[model samples]
Target chain A: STAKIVIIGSYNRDLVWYVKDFPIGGQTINGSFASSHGGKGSNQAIACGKVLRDPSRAFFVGAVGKDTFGDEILAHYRELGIPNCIKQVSGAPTGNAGIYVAESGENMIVISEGANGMLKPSLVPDLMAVLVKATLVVMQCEISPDNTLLFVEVIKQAKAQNSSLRFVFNPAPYRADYDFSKILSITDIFCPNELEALEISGTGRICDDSMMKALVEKMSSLSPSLKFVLFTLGSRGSRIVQTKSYESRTVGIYSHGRAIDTSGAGDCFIGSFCVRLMELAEESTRGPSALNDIDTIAEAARFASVAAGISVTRKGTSASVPRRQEVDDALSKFS
Target chain B: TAKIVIIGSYNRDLVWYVKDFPIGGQTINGSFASSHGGKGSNQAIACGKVLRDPSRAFFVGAVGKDTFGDEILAHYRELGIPNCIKQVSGAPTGNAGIYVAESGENMIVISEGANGMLKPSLVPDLMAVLVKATLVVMQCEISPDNTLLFVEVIKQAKAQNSSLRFVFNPAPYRADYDFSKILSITDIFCPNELEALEISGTEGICDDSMMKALVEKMSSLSPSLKFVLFTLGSRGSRIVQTKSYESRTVGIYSHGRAIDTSGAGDCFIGSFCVRLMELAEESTRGPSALNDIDTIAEAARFASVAAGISVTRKGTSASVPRRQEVDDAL
Candidate 1:
C-alpha cells in the first residue's frame, strides 16, 4: 500500500487591495484589487499533493462555508487529485482574509475565521479510520487549538496501535496563549521558524547558534517522543537537530531560482520534508526506523530545501509549489 | 406595457461599524455586519416595494452560483420582484467591503465579481424585455462596455417604442470611462452633487450659482436629455428640464431624524420613477402629460417623502420604505 499523508488545517480566500495610501477616517480611496486561495494548512496540503507520486495519497481535512469561495476550493482540490474530507457548514461564510498593500510595501491583514473556526472532531466523519492507516499526519496552528489537541490525542492512541504512524507539527503565526506541552509531547517532528522557536521555548529574542541550541534543548526536554527539531531560518537556511543524540546540522539554501513570492516557502518546506521522510521509511527494511537516522533526516531536509527553492520562483500559494519531477531535475543539476 | 427594468449589479456587503477608521499595520476590533447591497439591487427592491406589482419591476443582473446568489434570489422572491438574475460559473458573487464610522461616515471598496460578467450576450430576452419596458434604469457598477452595449440595444428598441425612457445614474463614478455615447441616448440623467459636477466638467461646489451652468453643459453633452435630477444630500433635490432649461428645487420632507443615510439616494430615485409612471397612467390632460412640469414636481415631492422615511433606518435595501409606509408617512 502507498504511504498516506493527512493534513488537517485552514482554508481561506485572500482578498487583496493595492493602495497608494491606506484610507483615513471619513475618507474613501480607490485601489486595485486581487484575490487568491490561502491558509497555512491548505498551502501545505497543495505542496504535498504536488510532490507525491499519487496525489490522492495526500488527504486534506478542513471546513469551509457553503459559499462560492468554498466551491472554488473543492474544485481546486479535485483538479489537483488531492482527496479531501471537507465539511460545508451553513450560517457562516467561507474563511476570508482582507489584505491591504500600500505602495510603500507596508501591509495590513484582517482575517475572519468563518467556517474554519467551526471545525471539530465530531464534524469530521470517520476521522479515526482515516488516521490509523496514515504513514504521517501533518498539522499547523491555523485551526482551533482545541481541535488540534483532540486530533493529536487521537493520533497518540493510533501511534501505539500502528507504530508506523508519525506526527509532524508546524507552529506558525505563533500564539502564546495556549499550553503546547500536550501536543508537543507526542509530536514526532516539531518544526518552527526562528521567531516561533524563540517564543515557544520562552527564550530571548536573538537567534544565534547558542540560542538555536538552547531552543532545541528546551523543546526536546518537554517530550521524550520528539525525535527531531527542524528549525528553519529564512534566507540563512535551516537547522536539523536530532533530539536523542543532540546532534545538529545546518543545511544552506539551494538556490534554484530568484525569489518571486516567498509567502508559501515554509509550507513547501514542511510538506516536501514529510514526503521525502515517508519515501525513505517505505524503502527501509524496518518501518519508521529511518526517522532515527540523522543522516537520513538531513537528506530529507536537503530534498525539501531544493523543493522550496523552486517554489519561490513562481507566484501564489498552491500554484507556486513544484512538481516531483521539477524538484528532481533541480536536485540533479545541483549535484 | 408599463414595466420598469433595472439593469445593474448585486453585491453582498460586508460592513464593519467601528468607532474610528482602521489604520494600516494595526489591529482593532469593530462590530461586523453583512447585508444585501448594490446600487442596482437597492433601486430594484425600492421600485418593487413602491410599485406594488411584481410584474411591473424586473431586476436584470448576474451573481455566482453560491449562497449569496441563492439568498438574493430568495430576497427578490419574498419582495415579489421578478428575478432576471443570471448565475455565472467560475466567479464569486459580487461583494463590497464597507467601513462605517460612529459619525455615520463610510468608505467603501467593491469587487465586481460576477457583476463584471454581466455582458449583454449573457442576458436572456434582452431585446424582448427592453422593447416592452416603459422605463429602463441603469448604474455604473457594471463594466462600461456592457453598459454601452445595453444602451445600443435600448436605442434599437427605442426605434420601435418611442415612449420608452432611459434613466442613467452615474454613481460610484469612474473618471477613466467616456460617457458621451450613453449620455446622448439617456432621457433622464440623474446624479448626485459630485457626479453632476464631474460629468459637467464643472470644478466647484454645487451651489445655486453653478446649477444652471451644470445643466447647460450637460444639455450640450446629451442632446436627447429631457431632465437632469441633481440630488443634493440633506439640502433636497433639483429638477432641471433640458429643452426649456426650467428648474425647480424641491425641499426634503422631514419624516424622521436621520440614522443611516446610506441608501437615501436610491430610495429617492426608485420612488420618483414609480410616482412618475403612476402619474403618466392617471393623466387625461394631453399626450404630453408625461412631460408636464407640475406632474414632475408631484413625483419629486412623493420621492422626497419616501427618501425622508429611509434615512431613519440602517442598511441599504433594508432601509427603503414600502409604498404603504411612504403613503402613511406622507
Candidate 2:
C-alpha cells in the first residue's frame, strides 16, 4: 500500500505466453511469443517499490529458490528499492508463468510456484516486526495459508506488542479452509476482489445483492476489530465497507484511462489506499477515524482510485503505479 | 645437369598424415597430426631461384593444370624467367607427402606430375630461345619421356640452330627405364649415390671405381665442346671431365653444406648447370675450351651446393636456393 511503505511478501518469475489467431483442430501454434518478468506477489511488490514515497524503506521478504528467476527477482528488488528479500531455498526453478493469448486477448495462465512454495511461517516473524514498525504491513494469498497466518499473527502480535502497528491483508485466489475469520481478527483491514471476497467470506454465491451484504455483515460480526473491508468491482471501481456501522464507500476509478489488464488493479488500489490511511493518522490520532468517515473514506478511496487509475495509463502491473508527485500532479488536473 | 636453368614450377601440395602413434601390439603411443602443403614443386623451382647470379637465365618448366598448386609453381614468373610451363588436364590436386612420428623425426613421401602427366616434349622451343639458354633440363619420371627425344635431337639441332637445349634426367623414383645410352650422347648427366655406381656399363656392371671413371669417361665421349657432369655429394661437389680429355678437375661447392631431402639435389644440379651455361656463353666468346669447362662446372657445382645446403637446413623440395651473399657469408 502507498501510505504504509510496502514490504512485499512474494516471488517473481518469467512469464512466456503464446499468441495466435483462430484455432484449428489439433493444430500446433508454437509460433508467436511474449515473455516478461511477472508474478502477482512480485508485481504488487514492484508497485510498492515504485509508488511508495520513501521507496527505499520498502523491504520485500519472500523465499525464492536459488535460480535465475529468483536471482532476477532479487535484482529487481535492488533496482526498484526493495531492501530486504529472502533467498532461502535450493529447489526447482525460482518460478515461472505460462499463458496462451487468443487474438481477442482472452488468456489462460498456469504457474509453477517453484521456490515460492518454500516461503514458510518461520520466516514471517522478523519481517512482521519490520512491517510492524512500518506504517502498514501487507500480504496476499500468493503465499501459503499457514505462512500467511504466520504473517498475520506476527503482525497481530506486533500490534499487541505496539498498538501503533497497522495491518492489511489481501486474501486473493481465496481458498477453502482459509480461516479468514481467524486471520481477519488480526488484520486492521482486509482487501480482496469481488470473487475472492465471496470465496473467503464463505459464501458460495455473489449474484444476490442481499447475500453480498449478509456476507459483509457476517464477516464484520466475526472480526469487529477489523475496521475496513474492500472489494474490487473491475471497471465499476471499488466498494469499501467499514465494519463499525457496516457503512460503505464506493470509489469509481474511471478517472484516467481504460485498463489493458485489470490483473493488479485491486492490489495496487489496496496498497496505495492503505498508505493514505496510515499517513492520515499523522494528521489525526483517530487512526481508523482518519479513514473511517465518508469524506475521509472518500479521500483514501479516491487516492487508491487515482493510484490505480494512473497505474493503468501506462502498461504492466509495475509500470502503472506513478510516484506520489506524479499522482498528486495528476490529481491537480492541471490546475 | 647443374648448368641447366629452370623457370616455373609449383608449390604442389604434399599430404598430411595425422594420428595417434602406433601401439605395436596392445597399447598406443602419443599425439600426432599433420596437413598437406605445397612441397614438391616448391623444391623444383627453388632450384631455379637461387643459382648462378640474379638474371635468372635458369629455366625449368612443367605443364600444370588450373589449381592452387599450379598457381604456386608459376606465381612468380615476372622476375627473370624463360620457360613457359604448359597447363595440364583436369584439376588434379598436385602431389603431397605426409607422415607422423612418435619422437619428432618424420618420414615423408610425394607424387610429382600435376594433371598434365607431363611429357618431356611439352617443353616449348621458344622458351630456350628466350633465355639464350644453355639447357640441362632435369625431370622426375613424372614427365614420362618428354625430351627423351630432345636428348637425341638437341646436339644436331644446336649444331644447326645454335639455340637448342640439353638435359639432365634424374628420374628419381622411376623403377623402369633405360635412357643410359642417351646420357653419353647428351651434354648433361645425373644420378644419385647408389644409382650412379649401381648402373652397369654396356659391357658389365659399373662398380664404385668404375662409376667415377665412367663419369669421367662419359664427359670424354661428349664433344670437346661439352663439360662433363654429376650431381655430386650435396655440398655442391661435382667431378667434371672435359669432353673426352684426360685434363679434368673436380668442382667443390662450399655452397651446398648439407641437405634434408633427396628431391632437391637433382633440381639444384639441373638449374645450376643451365644458368651457368647461359652465363658463360653470353659473357664469353670462344670455341668451348677448358676454361669454359671450369667455369661451367664450377658455377653449376656451387649453385647446386647452395640448393642442397639450403634443403638440408630447411624443408620442401624447392624452397628458394640460398643467395650469393649467404654463400659468401657462410
Candidate 3:
C-alpha cells in the first residue's frame, strides 16, 4: 500500500549575491549576500515530499559534512520528512555553490565539489535496502555524473529481484559528462529542461514541433523501454508524447496565475506526475473500472500541469509547493 | 607586557605512513596518520605559545570552516592559547597535507590551500585588534604573498606607535611574488631557509660565515630597514644580522642528532628572538634596552640552537620545539 521514491543528489549550500547583468573586471558596485538551501537532489527530494501524502517518507541519500552547511542540509531533509541517509564526511567540505545573480534572474555559479566530487560507484550498495524497497529511483547530475550511472545500475540490480522498477531521469543542464547511452536504457521517463532538450538534440534553440518530435524520436530510438517523453514549456504549458503505442496528442493546462521566481516549477511537475501515477496505479489495479496506460499519462500530465501552475503563483522552491489537500481543492474547482 | 601574537595560518594534518621517498603518479605504502599542527601561521603560533611563556596567550587571525579541518586548526590555536579572533568560513575545505617518507629519511609534501586562501584583507577589525595590540606579527606566503604584504601594512600601522615589530618572510617559493621592492619600509627582518637564501642573493647557499654576512649586507642595499635577516643553512647553521650595523654576527649550534631527517633545524627563528623581546620588553620603561639588544639576539640564537637540537632528535616543526622551558630554567 506504499509507493517508495529514492533520490540521490548533490547538497550545495548556495551563497547567492545580487549583482548587475554580467560581471567585468575593474567594475565595482555594491551587493548584498543571501544564503539558501539548494542542490538538485535536495530540491527534488523536497519536491517529492510535497507530492507524497501520509506518514511514509521518501528515501533521500547523499553526503555532507557535519558542519553548519551540513546541519542546514540535514534540517532540510528533516523539515521535508525525507529520510536521513545523507553521509557526513570528515575533513571534507560539504559541496558549496556560490551563485552570483543578476537583477534579471540569470546566475553564474562556482562550485567546490567537496565531499560530492569523490563519490564512487562502489558506494551504491550503501543505498541497496532503499533501492530494493522503492518502486522508483530518481536522479540528476549535480553530484558525480558517474555516480548517477552507478545509482541506475543498483536500481536495475534491485529490479532484477522484482520486475516493478522505474527510473526517472532529469538531465538538467545536460553536460557532456553524462553516460547517455547507459542512461537511455535505465530511464523509464526522460525530463529535460528547455536548454537541456536543445543541448541533447544538438540544436541552438527549439521553436517548432518538428524539432521537438525529432529530439523525442531520436531519444526513444536509443532506449526501447521508454514509455513517455515530457516537455515543460514554462508559461506556454507542457507537452507529453507516447510515440509508439498510442496516437500522439499535445495538451495544454493554462496557469491561473503568473510565474514568481520560477524556481522548482519543473520539479513540481515531476513530483505531481509521480503522485498521480501512484494514485492511478493503486486505483486501476484494485478497481473494476480500470484506466488504460494512455489515460494514466493524460491524467498524470493534467495533474502535474495543475501542480506546476499553482507553484508559479508563489515564491521560491520551498514555499511554493502545494499540499495534497490544496491540489485536491484546486482540482475540485475544475471538477 | 601582554604582547599579542597573531597565528594567521592553516592547519596541516600529516598522515605519516611512509618512511621513504614517494614517487610521482604512484602509490607507495605507509602507516599511522600523524596529524600535526602546521601551516606557516599555525607553526608560527606554536612558536608564539613557546615565546609568550608568562602571558601565554596570543591572537590567531585566520579563517577556516566549521568542518573538522577547522577543528584541527582550533585545536592548534588552543594548544597555542590564541585569542578568539580565528575566523571560520563555509566556502573552503580545511587543508590536508599528505607526507610520504622513505626508510632513507627522504620526504615529500603535497599541500592543499583551503584555509590559506581566505586572504588577509578579509580580517575584520576584531582580528586587526591583535595588529593594534601586539608589538609583532607573524606571517607566511602560503596564502598569497599579497596577503603577507597586507599583514605588512597592519605592521606598518602598528609601527607608527614606535613599537618594535618584525616579520619572518620564510616562504621562498613565493620569492617571485614578494614585491621585494615594497619590502623596504614594511619588514624589520626577513628569514630565509637555505633555499630561500638562494632567492634573495646570488651568493648561492651562503654556507660560509663570511658569505652569510655578505648576503645579509647585500639584502640591506635593496632596503635598509628591511635588513636584519637570519639565513638558515640546514642543521643549526644560521647568520642573524642587521644591515650596515656593527652589531651583526653568525651563530651555529651543530644539530648533531639530525639522523638525516633534514630541514627540521630552522625552528622559525622568529619565535626564538621574539621570545627574547618578551623577556627584555618587560623592562621597556624609563631606561631603554638598546645596549641589551645584542644579548637578546644571542640568547634567542642559543635558544634556537636548543630548539634545533630538540628537532633533529625528533622530527617535524611541532615536534621540534615543545616549549622553551629552557627560558623558564634560565
Candidate 4:
C-alpha cells in the first residue's frame, strides 16, 4: 500500500551522557555514554510509523551522512516497515547532538547540525512527490524556513493533483515576519506548545483560559480553512479548539508513571494525533458525521496524549516512543 | 595511495564500570556505557590516527542491519577510514560485554553476530584491495576459516607482486590454527607473551636461550617473513627476527602509565605498522627493504610509547592517541 502520510524533516543522532553532577567550564566528569536516534522530523515520523495502522502508510524524507547514522536511519525505518525516502549526502557528516544530564535530571545539549543544516529548499521536490498519496503531511521547524515553504508549496501541488490533503504544522522556535496567514489558509491543524503559541501570536508569556481562548479565536478568524488549533500547556494539560464553531476541549496528561523526560513529547502528540484523526476520518467515510464531534476529537487527543505520556517515561527520542500495543494498553486502562 | 588494508571484526562494546567484578550470582551496580570496539575496527582507528593521510587506511568488514552496525559504520567514516564493506541482513551486529573494575582490569564476553557471518565467499575484490596495500593486517577474532583464507590471499598477492608484507595478531587464541602455515607468508607476527609461548610450544619463556630457540625455530619455517613481537604487559615488548639471532628488547615507556589495558595491543600494532612503513621508506634499500634491526627497534619504541599512552586512558578506539601526541611523547 502507498504511504498515507509523508513527513519531510531533519535526522540527527543524539549522543548522551548522564553524570551525578555537571562540570563547570574547566571541570571533567566521568559518566556513561548513550546514543540514540533523534531529530524533530525523524522523531515525528517514527511516532507516526508506530501508530499508523499500515506500517507502509508512513514515508520520511530527509538527508543523512553516507555513514553509520544514514545506514542506521534506513535500517530503523525498515524496522518500522516504512519506506526509505531519504538521501545519503556526503558533503557533511551526519548531524549529532551531545546531551549532558546532571543527577538532578536537568540536561544541557549542544547540537552540531552537520548534514541537517545542508537540507535546502532545492531538495524538496523529490521529497514532496510522495505527498500525492498523502492524506496528511507532517512538517517541523528543524529545517530552514525557506525549505519549510518549499514543502508547503509541494504539498499544495500534491493537493491539487490528488484528493483533498491536510497539513499539520509545528512552527516551533517561531520565525517572525513570515506571513502565517498564507500558511494558515492550508493548515488543517496548527500546533505549538505554550511558548511557541504565545511568541508567534504576539501574546506575552502569560497563559490562562482567556489568553488561550483569545489566541485560538484570533487564529481561527485569520483563516477559514484552518480547522484546529492545538496548544499543549505544560503539566496543566492541553487545549484543542475547532475553528468552524469555536468549540473547545481540554485533555489531561495520561501516563503510566511520573514524567521522566519530555524531550520529544510534542512529536509523539502530533504524530499520534495525526494517526488517530486519520483512523477516525477513514472510519467515517460513509457519512459527513461526527468528524467534528467534541468527544471524537477528544478521543483522538486522549490517544495522542497517552502516546505523549509514554514518551516522558523513557530517556531518548526514538527509543522513547511506545509501540502501538503499549499505547493501546495504556489508553484502555486510562479510559 | 592506500598504504594499508585492515580486514577484521566489528563489535559494539557495552561496558559496565564496577568497584570490583561480581562473582557468579552476584549483582554489582555500576555505570554502563556503549562504545565501538572490535579488534579490526580498533586497529584500523589506531592506524588512521597515526597516519598523516586518512585515505591511506582502508577498512573492510561486515556489519548487521541494526543500530550497532550503524554506530560502528559511522565511527569508521568519522575516522576517515574508507569503508568499502558489506552489510549482512538477518544478523545483528557483533557486540561485547565488558566489566571494568576499579583496578582497571576488565572481564569481557562477546557475541559474534554478523561478524561470524563474514564469509570468505563474500570477497573476490578484497584480494584486489589486498594487492594494493604495502601491508595487509588481520586478526583471529573472525572465523578461523575466513582468516586462513585471508592468509592465502596475502600469499597469492605477495606471489603476484612480491613487495607486499603481512601482519597477524592471533588474539583470544585460536586452538586449531595453522600458525606455521600462515606465518610462512607473514612478514610481521604479533602475539602477546602468552600466545607466543603457546604457539611456540615452549614452557621456558623467561629463559633467553629457550626464547631465542623458539623464535629461530618459527622463522626457519617462515622464509618470507622477518620479525616476531612478543608483548609482555608492563615489562615492555620483545622483538626478534628470522634473519638475525640478535634479539631486541624495548622497555615500557617511562613517560606514561596504564589506566586500562584494553586497547594497548592495538595501539602497539597500529603504531608499529605506521613507523615500519615510514622507516622502510627512509632506509637506503627503499620500500622493499625488509626493515633493518634499528628500524624495527625504533618502530617498537614508537609503538610502545603509543600503547603506553593508550593504557593511561579508557575504552578501546577512544583511547587511541593521535600522531602529534605520539610524536610529542617520542
Candidate 5:
C-alpha cells in the first residue's frame, strides 16, 4: 500500500532531579541533578521511529526553538535515522520540563512550552504530498488547544484527497472542550487512558455498567468513522472497543518487570499500535479491510500492551521507550 | 605574575514555582525555568567580566557532553573567558539545589553531577598556567581530589615564587576538608561568617574574640598565610592580617535596594582580586609582596562596594556588577 506514518508534536528540554524529599514551603535543600529530553509528541516520534526502522516509511513533524535543545533534538533524530520533519523556531525560548522524582520513584512535572507555543496550523506545511499514500497520522495534546483542531483539519483535508488516509489521535495530557467529537468524525483510531476516555465520553466512572453502555454507544454514535478505541487502564490492563459493533474486550497487562517510571509508556503503546496497523495495511487483504479486522485489532492491542509494559520497567520519557527488536524479543514470554 | 585561575562546578539552575512545597505522596502545580549558575562559574564570570581583559582569568572545570555543557562552554567563549573546562562523556554537567520561594527569603537546594567526576589527574595539565599565575582562586564545587590538587600546585608555585597568592572560598561549606595542609600555602583565606566559625571551631560571628582567635590559629599553621577576609553578609565585612594582628571592618555601601544576594560574594572576590592586581601593577613591588594594612584596607573597601552593588540585582552570573558599574557607584 506504500503507506507511511506521520507524527506532529512538541519538543522540550527536560530537567529531572532526584531528591530524598521534596522541599517544604519556603524551604530549600539539595538533590541529585539529572537532565534529559522529553515532550509527548517527541517521545511518540522516537518510539514510532524505533518501531518503523526505515526513515522513508516513518515521518515526524514538529517544532522546536532555535536554542541548543532544538539542535539536540534534531541531532538525535538524525542519529536514529528518523527523517527530518522539524521546524526550528526563533523569538521564543525552547520548551522546558522540570520533573521531580522521589527516592521511591514517584514523580511530578511542570512544563513551560516556550517555542512549542508557536506551533500554529500554518507553520505545518500541507501534508497532501506525504499523505497521498499515508496509512496513518498520529497526534497528541502536547501542542496547544487551539492548534489541536488544526491537526484534525489537516487530516480532514488529506483524507479528502486520499480516502484511505487514517488518523490515530491520543488525547494525552487531556484538554477539555477540544471538540473531540468533531475531530473524531475523521479519526479512525482513538487512544486515551481511562481518565481521558471518561472525560471525553462524559462517563462518570470507568466500570459503571450503565455509564459504560451509554459511553460506548455515545462514542459509536458520535463518529461512525471511528473504528478503534484503545483505552488504557493502568495495572488493570486496557479495554479495546470496536465502534462498529459497539463491543469491547480487555487486553490484560503482561508484567515485563518491576515498574519504574511510566512517563512515556502510553506513547510507546500508540507507536507500536500504529506500527502494527500499518503492517496490516500492507497485507494482501487490503483496501481498508485491515482497519476493521477484529483479529488484527486484538493483535495490535496485545503488541502495544506488551510494549507499554516494557516501558514502565525503565525510566525517563524518550529514553525508556524500547526499540522494536526489544519489544519483539519480549513478546514471546508474555504471549 | 600573569593570570588568575578559577576551579569550580557548573550547574544549570532548574527553578520551579509553587504556592507551597510538595508533601509526601502529593503533587503540586507550578511554572518552570532553567537558569545558568554554579559557584565556580559565577565567580569566574565575575572575574572575567570585571577584568574585561582577555585571557586574564581562566576557568578550569568539567562538564558532561550534553546540551547544558554546550551552553556553558559557549557562554565562557562569548565572555572571552579562556577555559580548560574538559567535557566528560557519559557524566552529566553539575546541577545545583533547586530554588524555591523568592527575594531575600529565597530557599535553595543542590546536587552535583559532572563536577563530582573532576579528579586530580586532570590537574597537572593546568600546571603551565598555574605556574604563571600571580593569584589562584578555588572553591569547594569539585571533588576533594581536584581541590587538593590545586592546593598542592599553588603550594609548589609559591615555593618557586614566594609572592604567589591563593584565595580559598570554602562556600557551600564542608567540614571534611584537611585545612592543615591547605593553609600552609594559602595566602588569603576568604570565608563567610558561618564557614569562618565552622572552620575555626569557634562560636558565633559577632564575637570579635572568637573571630580574632580563629584567624590567629589558622595563620599559625603557616606564617606566610597572612590575611583572612571574613564576610558578614549585610552588616559588613571584616579584614584581619596575621603579621600586624591588625583588624578592621567595612560597612555596606550600596544606594540601590538589595533585590537578590545570590552572587554577591563572588563579586566581592573577583572585585577584590582585580583591585589587588591593579594596586600591584602600580607598585614597584609588582605583586611580589603581600604589602601593608593600607593596601588590604583599600581592597576590602573596594570589594565591599562591589558586593553591595551585586545584591541590588538578581540571579547568579547575570547579577555580577560590571567594573564600570562598581566604579560609578563608588
Candidate 6:
C-alpha cells in the first residue's frame, strides 16, 4: 500500500511590489506589482505534490476564506492533483500577505492571518479518519498554536493505533510561547532552520559547528522520543543528527546557479525530505530497523538538499518547486 | 441629452496598516488589507452613484485579464455604472501599494500595468459618447498622451456642442509634462493645493495671499482656462472664475468624524459635476446656467457636503455618498 502523507498548514495570497527604494513617511513613489500564492504550509504541500505526483498519497489540510483567493487556491490544488481537506470560512477573508521588495534585494512583509486564524480543530471534518491512515503527518507553525496542539495530540493517538505512523514537525517563524517538550516528545523528526533552532533552543546567537551541537543537545534534553533533528543552514547546507547517539552528518548543497528567489526554499527542503523519507522506508527490506539507520536519514537529507537547491534558482513560492524528474536529474549529475 | 464621460485608470489597492513606515532595507511587521481604487474609477463611481442613472455616466479605462479585473467589472455592474473598461492581455491589472501609518499618514507606490496600455486610439471609439457628453472628466493616472488626445477630441467636438465642458484634475502630478496645450482647452481645472502649486510653478506654501498669485500664474500659462477649483482637505474648497475674476469659498459641512480622507477629492469632483448637470437640467438658459458664479458655488457647496459625508467612512469608491444620502445631508 502507498504511504499516505498528510500536510497541515496555511494558504495566503501574496501581494508583492518591487520598488527602487522603500517609501519614506507620507511619500509616494512608483513601483511594479506582482501577486502569487504562498504560505509555509501551501509551499511545502506543493513541493510534496510536485515530487510525489500521486494524488491519493499526499493530502493538504488547511483553511481559506470563501472568496476569490480561496477559489484560486482550490483550483491550483486541483491542477497539481493534490487532494485537499480544506475548510472555507465565510466570516473572514482568505489569508493575505503584503511583500515590498527593494532593488537591493531587501524585503518587508506583512501577513494578515485572516481565515487562517479561524482554523479551529473542531472545524476540520474527518480528521481522525485521515490521521489514522497516514504513515507520516507533517505540520508547521503558521496555524494557531492551539490548533497545532490539537493536531499533535490527534497524531499521537493515531500513532498508538498504527505503529508505522510518524510525525514530522517543522518549527518555523518560531514563537516563544509554544510547549516544545510536549510537541517534541511525540515528534519523530524535528526540522528547524538555523534561526529557528537558535530561537527555539535558546542556544548561541550564530549557527556554527559548536552552536549546532548545542541545539541538538538542548532539543534532545527536551524530549527523549525525538528520533532526529534536521538542522538546515542556508547556503552552508544542513546537519542530520540522531538524538540518542548524538552522532551527526552534514549534507552539502547542490549548486545549480545563482539563486533568483530564495523564498519557500525551506518548505521545499522539508517537503522533499518527507517524500524521500517515505520512499526509503518503503524500499527497506529490513523495515523499521533500516529506516532508523543514520545512513538512510542522511541519504534522504541529500535528496531534500538537492531539491531545495533547484527551488532557489527559480522564482515564486510553489511555482519554484522542482519536479521529481528534475530532482533526479540534478542528483544524478551531482553524484 | 446631458451625459458624462470619465477617462482614467483602474488600480487594485493593496494597503498595509503599520505602526510606522519601514525604513529603507528594513523589514517590519504590519497588517494587510485591499480594496478597489484608481483616481478614474473612484471619480466615475462617485459620479455614477450621485447621478443614480446608469446611462448618464460612462467609465473608460483599461484593466488586465485577471481576478482583480473580474472583481472590478463585477463591482461596476453592481453599482449600475456602465463598464467601458478594456481588458488587455499579456499584462496584469494595475495596482497600488499603500502603506498607511497609525497617524493616518500614507505613502503610495503605483504600478500602471494595463493602465499604461490605455492609448489615444481609445478616444476615437468613444466619439459618440464624447459628442453628447455635457462634461468630460480626466486625471493624470493614465498616459498623458492619452489625456491630451482626449482633450483635443473634446476641443474639436466643442465646435458644434458649445456646452461640452472639459474637466481636468491634475492629480498624481507629473512635473515634466507640459500642460499648456491641455489647459488652453480645459473648461474647469481642478487640483488639490499641492497639485495646484506644481501646475502654477509656485514654490512657497499656499496661504490666503498665495491663492491669487497662483491663479495669475495659471492664467498666464493658459489664457482661455475658465475656472480653477482648489480642494482644500478638511478646511473647505475655493472656486475662481477667470472671466469675472470672482471667487467663492465653500466651507465643509461637518457631518461626522473624518475617518479616511483618501477618496475625498474624487467624491467632491463627482458630486460637484452631478450637481452641475442637475442645475443645467433645471435651468431654462441651458449649459450657460453653469457660467453663473452663484450657480457654480451652489454645485461646489453640494459637492463639499457629499465629500464631508464620504471622509466619515472608509475606502475609496466605497466611501462615495449616493445621491439620496448626499441630498439628505444637504
Which candidate has the top score in lDDT?
6
The TM-score of candidate 2 is: 0.47
DockQ of each: 0.21, 0.01, 0.03, 0.02, 0.24, 0.43
- By DockQ, the candidates rank as 6, 5, 1, 3, 4, 2
What is the docking quality class of candidate 3?
incorrect
**Per-model CA lDDT versus the true structure:** 0.80, 0.53, 0.56, 0.74, 0.75, 0.81
Q: Which candidate tops TM-score?
A: 6
Clashing pairs in 6: none
Evaluate residue A88 in candidate 3 and report its C-alpha lDDT on the 0 to 100 scale.
80
Misplaced by over 4 Å in model 2 are A1-8, A21-27, A202-209, A285-294, B1-330
Q: Give the fraction of true interface contacts kept by model 5.
A: 0.39
RMSD of each: 6.2, 27.9, 11.4, 14.1, 6.2, 4.3
Q: What digit string (tens of lDDT, one per residue) describes model 1 on residues B111-225? A: 7888888887898587888887778889888887888888888889877777678888888676754678888888888888888777767543688658777667767878678
lDDT of 3: 0.56
Worst ten in a row by lDDT for model 4 chain A: A22-31
In order of appearance, the predictions have TM-scores of 0.72, 0.47, 0.54, 0.51, 0.72, 0.83
Query: Which is better, 2 or 3, measured by TM-score?
Result: 3
lDDT per residue for candidate 3 within A139-162, as digits (tens), equals 777777777777777777776775
Q: Write the per-residue lDDT of candidate 2 for residues A52-113, one digit (tens) a residue.
A: 67766455667787765567667766777667656658754565543444556554444455
Instruction: Give the higher-DockQ candidate: 1 or 2.
Output: 1
Which of the two candidates, 5 or 6, achieves a greater TM-score against the reference? 6
Candidate 6 chain B, run of 10 with poorest lDDT: B21-30
The digit string of per-residue lDDT tens for model 1 on A214-296 reads 77778878786898898899888888888757798788899977777776788999999988888898898866787778878
Candidate 6's displacement at residue B86, Å, is 4.6
Ranked by TM-score, the better of candidates 2 and 5 is 5
Query: Quick one: ranking by lDDT, best first?
Result: 6, 1, 5, 4, 3, 2
True contacts kept of each: 0.26, 0.00, 0.00, 0.00, 0.39, 0.64
Please provide, for model 6 over A1-335, each residue's C-alpha lDDT reduced to its tens digit, 9 standing for 90 to 100: 24378888888888888998887665666788888998878888888888885655788889999998899999988987888878899978888777778888777776676888777668885777887877688887777777778877787888888777778999876766577778888898899878778878664354566766777888888675688898888888888888767788889988988899887888999999888887787788877455578888899999999999999999877788898999999999999
User: What TM-score does prediction 5 earn?
Assistant: 0.72
Task: Using TM-score, rank the candidates from best to worst.
Answer: 6, 5, 1, 3, 4, 2
